[PDB]
Amino acid sequence: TVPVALVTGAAKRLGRSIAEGLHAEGYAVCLHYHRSAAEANALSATLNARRPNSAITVQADLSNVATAPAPVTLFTRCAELVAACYTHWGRCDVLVNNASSFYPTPLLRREAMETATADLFGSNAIAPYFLIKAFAHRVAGTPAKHRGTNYSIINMVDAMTNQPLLGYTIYTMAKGALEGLTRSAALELAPLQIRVNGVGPGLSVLVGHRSKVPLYQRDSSAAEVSDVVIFLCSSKAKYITGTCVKVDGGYSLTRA
Amino acid sequence: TVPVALVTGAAKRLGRSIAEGLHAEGYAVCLHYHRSAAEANALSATLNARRPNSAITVQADLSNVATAPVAPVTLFTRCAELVAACYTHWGRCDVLVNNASSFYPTPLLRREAMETATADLFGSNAIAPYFLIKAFAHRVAGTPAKHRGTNYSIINMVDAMTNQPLLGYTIYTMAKGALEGLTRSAALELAPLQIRVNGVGPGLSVLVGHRSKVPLYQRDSSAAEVSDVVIFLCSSKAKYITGTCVKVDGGYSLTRA
Amino acid sequence: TVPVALVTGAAKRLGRSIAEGLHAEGYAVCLHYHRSAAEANALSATLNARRPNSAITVQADLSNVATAPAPVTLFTRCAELVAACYTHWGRCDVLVNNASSFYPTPLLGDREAMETATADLFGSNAIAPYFLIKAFAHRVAGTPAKHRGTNYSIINMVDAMTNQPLLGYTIYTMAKGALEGLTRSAALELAPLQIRVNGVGPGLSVLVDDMPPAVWEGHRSKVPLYQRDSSAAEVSDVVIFLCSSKAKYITGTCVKVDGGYSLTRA
Amino acid sequence: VPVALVTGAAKRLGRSIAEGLHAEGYAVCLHYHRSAAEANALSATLNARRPNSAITVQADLSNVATAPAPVTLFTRCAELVAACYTHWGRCDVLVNNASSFYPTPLLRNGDREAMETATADLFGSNAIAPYFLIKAFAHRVAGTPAKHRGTNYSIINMVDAMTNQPLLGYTIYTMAKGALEGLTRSAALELAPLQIRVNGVGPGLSVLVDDMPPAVWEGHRSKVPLYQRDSSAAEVSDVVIFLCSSKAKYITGTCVKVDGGYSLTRA
Numbered sequence A: 001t002v003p004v005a006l007v008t009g010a011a012k013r014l015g016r017s018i019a020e021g022l023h024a025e026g027y028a029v030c031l032h033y034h035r036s037a038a039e040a041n042a043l044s045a046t047l048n049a050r051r052p053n054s055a056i057t058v059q060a061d062l063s064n065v066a067t068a069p070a071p072v073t074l075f076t077r078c079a080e081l082v083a084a085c086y087t088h089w090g091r092c093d094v095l096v097n098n099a100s101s102f103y104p105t106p107l108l109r110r111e112a113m114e115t116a117t118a119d120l121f122g123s124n125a126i127a128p129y130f131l132i133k134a135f136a137h138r139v140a141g142t143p144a145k146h147r148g149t150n151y152s153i154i155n156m157v158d159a160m161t162n163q164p165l166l167g168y169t170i171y172t173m174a175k176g177a178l179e180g181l182t183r184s185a186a187l188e189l190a191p192l193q194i195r196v197n198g199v200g201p202g203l204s205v206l207v208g209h210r211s212k213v214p215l216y217q218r219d220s221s222a223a224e225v226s227d228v229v230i231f232l233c234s235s236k237a238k239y240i241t242g243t244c245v246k247v248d249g250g251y252s253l254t255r256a
Numbered sequence B: 001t002v003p004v005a006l007v008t009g010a011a012k013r014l015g016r017s018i019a020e021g022l023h024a025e026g027y028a029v030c031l032h033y034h035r036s037a038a039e040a041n042a043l044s045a046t047l048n049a050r051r052p053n054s055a056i057t058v059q060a061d062l063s064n065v066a067t068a069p070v071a072p073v074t075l076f077t078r079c080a081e082l083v084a085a086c087y088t089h090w091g092r093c094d095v096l097v098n099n100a101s102s103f104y105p106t107p108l109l110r111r112e113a114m115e116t117a118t119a120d121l122f123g124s125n126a127i128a129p130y131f132l133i134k135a136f137a138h139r140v141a142g143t144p145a146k147h148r149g150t151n152y153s154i155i156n157m158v159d160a161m162t163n164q165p166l167l168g169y170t171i172y173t174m175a176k177g178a179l180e181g182l183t184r185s186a187a188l189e190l191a192p193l194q195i196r197v198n199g200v201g202p203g204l205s206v207l208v209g210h211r212s213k214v215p216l217y218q219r220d221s222s223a224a225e226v227s228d229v230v231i232f233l234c235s236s237k238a239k240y241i242t243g244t245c246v247k248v249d250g251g252y253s254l255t256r257a
Numbered sequence C: 001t002v003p004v005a006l007v008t009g010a011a012k013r014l015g016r017s018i019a020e021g022l023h024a025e026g027y028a029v030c031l032h033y034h035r036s037a038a039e040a041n042a043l044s045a046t047l048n049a050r051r052p053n054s055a056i057t058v059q060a061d062l063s064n065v066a067t068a069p070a071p072v073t074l075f076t077r078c079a080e081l082v083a084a085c086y087t088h089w090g091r092c093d094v095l096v097n098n099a100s101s102f103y104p105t106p107l108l109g110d111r112e113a114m115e116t117a118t119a120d121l122f123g124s125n126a127i128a129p130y131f132l133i134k135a136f137a138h139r140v141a142g143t144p145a146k147h148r149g150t151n152y153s154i155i156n157m158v159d160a161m162t163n164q165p166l167l168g169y170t171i172y173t174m175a176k177g178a179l180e181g182l183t184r185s186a187a188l189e190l191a192p193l194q195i196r197v198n199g200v201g202p203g204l205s206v207l208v209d210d211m212p213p214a215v216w217e218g219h220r221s222k223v224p225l226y227q228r229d230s231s232a233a234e235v236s237d238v239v240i241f242l243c244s245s246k247a248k249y250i251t252g253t254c255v256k257v258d259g260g261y262s263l264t265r266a
Numbered sequence D: 001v002p003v004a005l006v007t008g009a010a011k012r013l014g015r016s017i018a019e020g021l022h023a024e025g026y027a028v029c030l031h032y033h034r035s036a037a038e039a040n041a042l043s044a045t046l047n048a049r050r051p052n053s054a055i056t057v058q059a060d061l062s063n064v065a066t067a068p069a070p071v072t073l074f075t076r077c078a079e080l081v082a083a084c085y086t087h088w089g090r091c092d093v094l095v096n097n098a099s100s101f102y103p104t105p106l107l108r109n110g111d112r113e114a115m116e117t118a119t120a121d122l123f124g125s126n127a128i129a130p131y132f133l134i135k136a137f138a139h140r141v142a143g144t145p146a147k148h149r150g151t152n153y154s155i156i157n158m159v160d161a162m163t164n165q166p167l168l169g170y171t172i173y174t175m176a177k178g179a180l181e182g183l184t185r186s187a188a189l190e191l192a193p194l195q196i197r198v199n200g201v202g203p204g205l206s207v208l209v210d211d212m213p214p215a216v217w218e219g220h221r222s223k224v225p226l227y228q229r230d231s232s233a234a235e236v237s238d239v240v241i242f243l244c245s246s247k248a249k250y251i252t253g254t255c256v257k258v259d260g261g262y263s264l265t266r267a
């Protein structure tokens, strides 16, 4: 049986490493992207060349706004992502909510606050919520005998949000909501055997900071984070649910 | 000097107790409300009868949506207008208590009812408090240092039990999680202005059963049992506390199924 | 109608401030001390001059070791502290586990060093508070309900910063973690007796300054709120509040009093 | 061939941890206190599958002095780590799994020896011994020339996912696990320069002891949201093995719950 993984923001960096890792374990991967069409398509080509029909790409703005084709809502866009997996392969075993906007929203210095609120909250929290809902709906609608044996949802949280990055309030708030989603979905979906966990990087694949990380005095590589994601999705982690695992080299143990 | 407190959702229950307690300590109180006009106005009459010009009421839907003029009005604007009402009337705003909150189910397992739920639950519990804190801070920043108050305090009403989620209340739980994040982020960012930001998280308070599950007293709490903690955090005796959430839950979060 | 408070390590700094604040609220205070007899006795004199028979002092090494009189165990010494309140005033309403040893135990005539550090650091910060709470609770349980006080409150002095460990203080950090557990465990088990158990965790308070000024100033400057360590009152007022009847629904919780220091990262 | 030292390795989780590390290629030093027969049988099985891949060492990890000047807990702990170096010339992984667990009620409704031994036993096995073991483990790595050091040092502390929602009447045990969490963070920070990772794994309900009426047993496991059952030993041990693998080399100072969502419940 070939399981299917939907990974949002899979075009590069961590999402790509997650997609690659899942692919190496035998998963067919649906690579979501927003603006990185070229990178998403190149990654799909590479995976499909290794194993035919093992990758596809889907475009979607995960910001909490309506888009043009009656306007299309974020929920619809989200359901369409999950549906794309079912239409193409007939299944969706894993969902990795990785796509994320990250930029300042200083409390102390228009409609710029409007798009920021919708973009930061949508990608990091509201979209994951709808995606999880669509994912669960498809599992519930599948007759028990036909269901997969290892449903796993991973939310990409942030090991450092409890020690907030100055000026990033909305982003920090959204990761906070993502943690809540992880616990609430883990509890509510347990009866369907759908595990919901979080993985929270500290500093990874930086585009100074490095020297502050206790372990190795550097930010992590993409694999150092993605291997943890892959492990949580494996059958060896079947009793883990509702938990967030930090992958930060001891950074959250530091103080100013 | 008579300090001013803005309390959202002040018409009844915890909010009213918070408004009353602050009032008893000498604060002039701006009582925010959404649909409880009668209650808000009655509370205002009581406080003003006790001490003239010590209370006012301001209406606002804190849901993350555009309303119609009384161009559409955004939640930010409505939030800035709440803080501005304090400055216009009394020339100051020392304390902000983000208490207003919608709470109802959003089950993952069973269309336009989803969009209003998202905007309502997230707006009242998280987005509105963000904009309110922003407006509050901007007013403080724009005040010349020599004229600023000596005890700025913002309290976010969180929830002691959200880490042990109520089945079927996902959006609400997520919003409180966001509110916790706002508490920490605002406490860090606003420290230079000496604006403290803390949280108070009830377990079971003034239930309209679960009661017997509370380790301490085997009952839900009274409004005062929660409001007194809020008032204390607002006091100069709590001036070194910031970015922390205090549970007022009688040990309920220490339980397991 | 005068309540009694037992405060360990009450001779100076935070403990003194806690004892003074409880005294100002009308409590009679049993001031525990280990090595600071002179300071403890002076504090007692002050309090008793303000209000006769409102203060006493008891000496006790709270390290997890047997002392000389069969040898006396820590538990016995602990029970003896609580008993001292009952013998003198017939009651014990509040217990503040404040006494605490704090020095390095780096991981990277010597057997005596590691052996006494473990007992001292763990005893003062965790084992003694455990036995003191046990003693305190037994006295409440053995009191007929009609005579019991209406506001029993135990406060454990934790540390807002132990989750971001101070390099080289492992045993101390371990003991404070044990103290957090004691707070939650005692809060749950003692709820039926209406004995509230809470923690107060300072960040940097009345910071010891045996170091260059730039270094000392470097440390306080890291605190987001005020860029300074706190005063003793800034911590003690929170303790006093948690002990008051207005905090009677709060139990099993640890309150940070750190000016946002725990929100920082390197 | 890397070496793992696993305390309380004779049965249950420790056995499974020892077996899993063994299946990954580790030589395993199986520590035990009272389960000699079980430890030796486990060693026999491992050595039969791969010669010289297992040894056993006995030690009371309670915070008391033993019979030889009396022997201290620290010495006993240093001796465990040393036994790995003496036999195989290395110690790459340490799993602090041994743990005593029994009630210490605050209220009652010979005597002194039980209180004194409970404190030392519960605290020693769950916290003080792990401390001394980590210290011994670290001293050995520091004394090894960088050129001879292993490339994946990993320490795992077996914590408890449910201690924050205390088991009524288990105060000392709960206190010791809290200390263990502290040790995990403190050691992770201090040993980071030597590339020694220190993490925790905290079970919820695992291979639940069933010395009670079946319905009471069904009742407890049914409180667990995922699967409505306690976990298998492998379900916990596989997570330990994963954290010890090179795939987890950027993870340190973190405690991972393996509780099927139990800590998410409320009464």
Ligand SMILES: NC(=O)c1ccc[n+]([C@@H]2O[C@H](COP(=O)([O-])OP(=O)(O)OC[C@H]3O[C@@H](n4cnc5c(N)ncnc54)[C@H](OP(=O)(O)O)[C@@H]3O)[C@@H](O)[C@H]2O)c1
Pocket (backbone or CB within 6 Å): A008, A009, A010, A011, A012, A013, A014, A015, A032, A033, A034, A035, A036, A037, A060, A061, A062, A063, A097, A098, A099, A100, A101, A102, A119, A123, A156, A157, A158, A159, A200, A201, A202, A203, A204, A205, A206
């Ligand atoms: N790297 C780190 O040090 C770090 C630290 C802590 C947490 N994290 C978390 O780990 C995850 C991955 O980190 P990363 O650094 O790889 O992320 P990233 O490079 O910052 O962004 C990942 C992808 O998110 C997508 N995205 C952004 N806004 C979107 C929107 N409005 N709608 C749909 N997609 C959107 C983008 O896709 P397109 O390019 O196609 O437009 C982007 O490529 C994120 O959730 C992040 O919060 C990362």
Ligand SMILES: NC(=O)c1ccc[n+]([C@@H]2O[C@H](COP(=O)([O-])OP(=O)(O)OC[C@H]3O[C@@H](n4cnc5c(N)ncnc54)[C@H](OP(=O)(O)O)[C@@H]3O)[C@@H](O)[C@H]2O)c1
Pocket (backbone or CB within 6 Å): B008, B009, B010, B011, B012, B013, B014, B015, B032, B033, B034, B035, B036, B037, B060, B061, B062, B063, B098, B099, B100, B101, B102, B103, B120, B124, B157, B158, B159, B160, B201, B202, B203, B204, B205, B206, B207
């Ligand atoms: N009581 C508890 O057991 C409990 C437990 C945990 C946490 N809390 C938290 O403590 C706080 C107070 O609790 P409570 O029980 O007193 O609250 P509540 O009775 O449920 O509601 C408080 C007020 O919030 C206002 N509100 C709701 N939706 C709004 C919106 N869309 N826009 C503007 N205002 C809105 C309402 O004002 P109007 O009536 O004027 O329309 C309502 O009166 C809340 O934040 C709650 O989350 C309470």
Ligand SMILES: NC(=O)c1ccc[n+]([C@@H]2O[C@H](COP(=O)([O-])OP(=O)(O)OC[C@H]3O[C@@H](n4cnc5c(N)ncnc54)[C@H](OP(=O)(O)O)[C@@H]3O)[C@@H](O)[C@H]2O)c1
Pocket (backbone or CB within 6 Å): C008, C009, C010, C011, C012, C013, C014, C015, C032, C033, C034, C035, C036, C037, C060, C061, C062, C063, C097, C098, C099, C100, C101, C102, C120, C123, C124, C157, C158, C159, C160, C201, C202, C203, C204, C205, C206, C207
């Ligand atoms: N100050 C801070 O920045 C800070 C930060 C975090 C937490 N805290 C916590 O707050 C509490 C009070 O802080 P502090 O700075 O005021 O404490 P402190 O000055 O360091 O010491 C408090 C007292 O504890 C007593 N003590 C130490 N070891 C003892 C033992 N073996 N047996 C009996 N008594 C012992 C000593 O009494 P004698 O002098 O009579 O011998 C000492 O005066 C402590 O629990 C501390 O851990 C303080």
Ligand SMILES: NC(=O)c1ccc[n+]([C@@H]2O[C@H](COP(=O)([O-])OP(=O)(O)OC[C@H]3O[C@@H](n4cnc5c(N)ncnc54)[C@H](OP(=O)(O)O)[C@@H]3O)[C@@H](O)[C@H]2O)c1
Pocket (backbone or CB within 6 Å): D007, D008, D009, D010, D011, D012, D013, D014, D031, D032, D033, D034, D035, D036, D059, D060, D061, D062, D096, D097, D098, D099, D100, D101, D121, D125, D158, D159, D160, D161, D202, D203, D204, D205, D206, D207, D208
């Ligand atoms: N099973 C669970 O549901 C559960 C839940 C939460 C956490 N945990 C943690 O996971 C770990 C393993 O759990 P488990 O249930 O497998 O443990 P266990 O069966 O209860 O005991 C493991 C071993 O610890 C050793 N031990 C006890 N006291 C000792 C002492 N004084 N000195 C030296 N060794 C001592 C014993 O070895 P000998 O038999 O040779 O004497 C015992 O077999 C423990 O740390 C436990 O706290 C388990």
Ligand SMILES: C[C@H](O)[C@H](O)[C@H]1CNc2nc(N)[nH]c(=O)c2N1
Pocket (backbone or CB within 6 Å): A100, A101, A102, A158, A165, A202, A203, A204, A206
């Ligand atoms: C620089 C920053 O602190 C850190 O490396 C993280 C924070 N969270 C992130 N989140 C997103 N979406 N993208 C990033 O690059 C990061 N970087």
Ligand SMILES: C[C@H](O)[C@H](O)[C@H]1CNc2nc(N)[nH]c(=O)c2N1
Pocket (backbone or CB within 6 Å): B100, B101, B102, B103, B159, B166, B203, B204, B205
């Ligand atoms: C009913 C629930 O158990 C609990 O009593 C709290 C949770 N959060 C709440 N939040 C709001 N806004 N209103 C409420 O009545 C409650 N009730």
Ligand SMILES: C[C@H](O)[C@H](O)[C@H]1CNc2nc(N)[nH]c(=O)c2N1
Pocket (backbone or CB within 6 Å): C099, C100, C101, C102, C159, C166, C203, C204, C205, C207, C208
């Ligand atoms: C020095 C350190 O950073 C911090 O201020 C605290 C930690 N805990 C303490 N605990 C005790 N007993 N005494 C102290 O002075 C302190 N100092």
Ligand SMILES: C[C@H](O)[C@H](O)[C@H]1CNc2nc(N)[nH]c(=O)c2N1
Pocket (backbone or CB within 6 Å): D098, D099, D100, D101, D160, D167, D204, D205, D206, D208, D209
């Ligand atoms: C019985 C309890 O609920 C839980 O399953 C755990 C707690 N910690 C434990 N610790 C040890 N050492 N052994 C055990 O069997 C357990 N069981």
